[PDB]
Scaffold this active site. Structure first.
Site, PDB file in Angstrom:
ATOM      1  N   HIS A  43      31.205  -3.535  96.124  1.00 21.22           N
ATOM      2  CA  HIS A  43      31.297  -2.869  94.958  1.00 21.22           C
ATOM      3  C   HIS A  43      31.117  -1.588  95.223  1.00 21.22           C
ATOM      4  CE1 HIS A  43      30.432  -6.152  91.832  1.00 21.22           C
ATOM      5  NE2 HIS A  43      29.953  -6.682  92.962  1.00 21.22           N
ATOM      6  N   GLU A  54      27.047  -1.445  95.704  1.00 18.73           N
ATOM      7  CA  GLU A  54      26.599  -2.508  96.319  1.00 18.73           C
ATOM      8  C   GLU A  54      27.255  -3.356  96.914  1.00 18.73           C
ATOM      9  OE1 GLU A  54      25.753  -4.695  92.653  1.00 18.73           O
ATOM     10  OE2 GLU A  54      25.000  -6.480  93.476  1.00 18.73           O
TER      11      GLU A  54
END
Ligand SMILES: *[C@@H]1O[C@H](CO)[C@@H](O[C@@H]2O[C@H](CO)[C@@H](O)[C@H](O)[C@H]2NC(C)=O)[C@H](O)[C@H]1NC(C)=O
Ligand SMILES: *[C@@H]1O[C@H](CO)[C@@H](O)[C@H](O)[C@H]1NC(C)=O
Ligand SMILES: *[C@@H]1O[C@H](CO)[C@@H](O)[C@H](O)[C@H]1NC(C)=O
Ligand SMILES: *[C@H]1O[C@H](CO)[C@@H](O)[C@H](O)[C@@H]1O
Ligand SMILES: [Mg+2]
Length: 436
Positions: free
Chosen positions: A228, A212
């Site tokens: 992420h 992400e």
């Protein structure tokens, strides 16, 4: 999930730009689609709900497979039900819409055609957009971000998934969300339990994991840019607590990085940079530029941020925390920040920059959302202290000006019902091509 036939699905138009160099941009006719979780889900046989409120009909959905066979996602009234207005270059998302029923927030994806998400590989590129966050108070998050969802919404290898990208199927992220009704071509009825701290007041047995890139998570108080990592960058299915993330007994026990390597100017010690009347003045629209630089081998090694407001180019603020220097996201920054703040470096654990490189190569889907936070009241983004009891003297604790009592959904869904965000003027191209 099946294709419902009771309400036509028409994806609202959104024009965005591809740039090749400064002053050379051309338009793309894209469209937006609502995430499946917000949709009416009913029997293929008629109008009987498979899911109502926060529980399932167990006759239609006795198990995950049969539920997927029996249940159809139907078309969305974008403006009337969901407060989503996509016109020209702009996408407006309203926080609360009290139409026939109460709707809170939305999550949307950019489409290339009726049955495919647009994908992006931002290596050596920048993503640029305009945003108006002036109507976003404490507790709100207007998020614009990317996840490596399957372009077709998963239909190619999921026989019980006919709805696909057309109906906003296929979401995954670095939190391995368990509140999803459909994950990887199956329903999530098995193990489903109501839960007060979930966005939709429920959690299933399985979660939906992937990498992400949080390009933008913000309100008028604070903003954060947060990549992420994940062991596997595309969708994987996890089981219960083994998911890690928000609702697990062990947040860091999963295969993804739920915290990310974040840059929030305020958290990084500069409280004068971003907010109302500040250098980046959240009272008015501004341009957000995010650049994805590589090493000599084409692997991501730095994320830079610039703002443009009133035609003035504004470099990202320097981190002022002793031991954490610079104004960009690099491996040195991420290592230093996690060490100095005393946070677990799950970013590094799950492959950091190499993981994000792989996510870009897989292809990213653009997500545009507006949400409140049933788990942490958005305090991680905008609070004078997160955790609420933690010492504001301790580096990394302060993130914004909002009170520790701010952002409770039952409070703000009333008091901030007029809240909204507008994303506009999306531009993608080589470094330096989208602004000057
Ligand atoms: C999705 O989650 C459900 C619920 O946790 C899983 O169903 C379990 O499956 C195991 C192994 O077959 C059984 O022993 C349990 O009885 C099931 N639990 C429940 C509550 O039904 C299912 O396996 C998960 N699917 C995937 C692909 O991970
Ligand atoms: C569940 O779905 C079945 C099949 O459509 C229907 O007969 C029933 O009324 C629904 N509701 C409940 C509470 O079982
Ligand atoms: C982009 O512009 C910056 C600032 O002028 C410069 O340092 C950099 O070399 C440029 N990079 C590319 C790829 O054009
Ligand atoms: C439901 O209750 C939980 C506690 O388990 C809270 O965290 C949440 O805010 C909601 O009130
Ligand atoms: Mg969730």
């Amino acid at each position: 999930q099946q294709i419902g036939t009771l309400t036509t699905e028409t994806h609202p138009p959104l024009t965005w730009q591809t740039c090749t160099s400064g002053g050379s941009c051309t338009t793309n006719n894209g469209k937006v689609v609502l995430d499946a979780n917000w949709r009416w889900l009913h029997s293929t046989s008629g109008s009987t709900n498979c899911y109502t409120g926060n529980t399932w009909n167990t006759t239609l959905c006795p198990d995950d497979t049969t539920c997927a066979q029996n249940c159809a996602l139907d078309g969305a009234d974008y403006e009337g039900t969901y407060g989503i207005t996509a016109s020209g270059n702009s996408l407006r998302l309203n926080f609360v819409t009290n139409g026939s029923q109460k709707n809170v927030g939305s999550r949307t994806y950019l489409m290339k055609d009726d049955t495919h998400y647009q994908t992006f590989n931002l290596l050596n590129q920048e993503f640029t957009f305009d945003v108006d966050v002036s109507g976003l108070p404490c507790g709100l998050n207007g998020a614009l971000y990317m996840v490596p969802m399957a372009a077709d919404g998963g239909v190619s290898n999921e026989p019980n998934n006919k709805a696909g990208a057309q109906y906003g199927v296929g979401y995954c992220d670095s939190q391995c969300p368990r509140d999803l009704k459909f994950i990887a071509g199956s329903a999530n009825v098995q193990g489903w339990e109501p839960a007060s701290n979930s966005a939709n007041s429920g959690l299933g047995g399985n979660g939906s994991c992937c990498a992400e890139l949080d390009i933008w998570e913000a309100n008028s108080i604070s903003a954060a840019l947060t990549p992420h990592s994940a062991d596997t960058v595309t969708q994987t299915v996890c089981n219960g607590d083994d998911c890690g993330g928000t609702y697990s007994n062990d947040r860091y026990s999963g295969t993804t990085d739920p915290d990310g390597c974040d840059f929030n100017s305020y958290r990084q010690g500069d409280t004068s940079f971003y907010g109302p009347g500040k250098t980046v003045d959240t009272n008015s629209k501004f341009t957000v530029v995010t650049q994805f630089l590589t090493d000599s081998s084409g692997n991501l090694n730095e994320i830079k941020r610039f703002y443009v407001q009133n035609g003035v180019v504004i470099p990202n603020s320097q981190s002022t925390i002793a031991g954490i220097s610079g104004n960009s996201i690099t491996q040195d920054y991420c290592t230093a920040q996690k060490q100095v703040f005393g946070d677990t470096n799950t970013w590094e654990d799950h492959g950091g920059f190499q993981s994000m490189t792989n996510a870009f190569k897989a292809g990213m889907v653009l997500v545009m959302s507006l949400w409140d936070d049933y788990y942490a009241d958005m305090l991680w983004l905008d609070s004078v202290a997160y955790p609420t009891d933690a010492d504001p003297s301790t580096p990394g604790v302060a993130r914004g000006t909002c009170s520790t009592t701010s952002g409770v959904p039952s409070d703000i869904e009333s008091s901030a019902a007029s809240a909204y965000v507008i994303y506009s003027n999306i531009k993608v191209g080589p470094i330096n091509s989208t602004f000057s």
